[PDB]
Amino acid sequence: PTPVEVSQLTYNADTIGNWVPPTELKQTYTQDITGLKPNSKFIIVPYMDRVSSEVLQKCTITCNEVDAVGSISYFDTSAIKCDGYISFQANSIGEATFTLVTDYQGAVDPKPYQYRIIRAIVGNN
Amino acid sequence: TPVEVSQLTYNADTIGNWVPPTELKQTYTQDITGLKPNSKFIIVPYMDRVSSEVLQKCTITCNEVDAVGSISYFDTSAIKCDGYISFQANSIGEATFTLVTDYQGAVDPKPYQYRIIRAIVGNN
């Protein structure tokens, strides 16, 4: 494995996905993001391309991986929030686990909240 | 002393506000300043902002040679906080962005908001 030289640093920011929506109005649950390069270091940020529910769908996310730092916030009604970030390292099999805490006023058919994963392509990252 | 590859971290704490429009349809530019000269960055949108409920659309590109991508904001019903731009800062630590806005109302608009991410590795 030949490391990418520092002078050749670039960011890959095209890995996007969906957070699994809640089945209850108040829920705490986990989701495993899979298929990441094992042991690579990432920043995950929220983004939004999503019709507002207009029923106050609040979601907060943290990461369960060792040494992960930060928190992500979504809110879709009036005071829109698409905020925060988590720095984390994928585990030895290319997975990271997150904890979702949701508090939705209505949850008939919730549209997923959306994330983007950012990876510096440098060294063996 | 350069940062060796095994000590890669990210700094994602530089945030800022995009200059807001004064006409309903407007094109303008903004110089972002105070970046490490010649370092490579990624800029992403974020939102922590009360919606205008009057269809404030903003589209952003970067004028820097080497820049790639585009950012979109929209605050009413079909919400957009989307896209990204990868770019290098210039020799004096700056980058120029072009904003194209299409706002159904523009009475004292609240800025759209951004986050700059830097990989801390090598001399970046």
Numbering used by the authors:
A (entry chain B): 2 to 126
B (entry chain A): 3 to 126
The publication says:
A major factor that limits the expansion of shrimp cultures is, however, infectious diseases from viruses, such as P. vannamei nodavirus (PvNV) and M. rosenbergii nodavirus (MrNV), which have inflicted heavy economic losses. The Nodaviridae genome comprises two single-stranded positive-sense RNA that encode the capsid protein for viral capsid assembly, the RNA polymerase for RNA replication, and the B2 protein for host RNA interference suppressor. While the shell domains (S-domains) of PvNV and MrNV contain conserved sequences of 62% identity, the protrusion domains (P-domains) and N-arms show low sequence identities of only 17% and 43%, respectively. In this work, we have determined the cryo-EM structures of T = 3 and T = 1 PvNV-LPs at atomic resolution, the crystal structures of the P-domains of PvNV and MrNV (PvNVPd and MrNVPd), and the crystal structure of the S-domain of PvNV (ΔN-ARM-PvNVSd) in the T = 1 subviral particle (SVP).
